[PDB]
């Protein structure tokens, strides 16, 4: 599983 | 698909108005996985998910770790330079 970021 | 430009104007107070997955470390690019609406990369109109982000204002994205990738994308200001391909 990858993370996954707001920007 | 074929490897695309494209420019993205925000303002100070925002943020780009995107999610990114991937990076480096999990073998895969810097992926677009949302496009929040309203917010500046839907505003500009070329910018869409599933987009690998290759590099931004000339700075090579292909290699970055996500937290790399998180740090260069949030550093950019005013009128910002996308190299983006859908795959």
Redesign the interface.
């Known amino acids: 599983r990858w993370p996954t970021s707001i920007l | 698909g074929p490897i695309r430009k494209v420019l993205l104007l925000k303002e100070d107070h925002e ?2 108005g ?6 480096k470390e ?1 073998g ?1 690019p810097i992926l677009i ?2 496009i ?1 609406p309203g917010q500046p990369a839907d505003r500009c109109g070329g910018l869409h998910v599933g987009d690998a982000i290759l590099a931004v204002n000339g700075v090579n994205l292909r290699d970055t770790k ?2 790399e990738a ?1 740090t260069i ?2 550093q950019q200001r005013g009128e910002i330079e996308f190299e983006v391909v859908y795959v």
């Open positions: 943020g780009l995107i999610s990114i997955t991937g990076g999990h895969v996985s949302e929040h996500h937290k998180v994308l949030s």
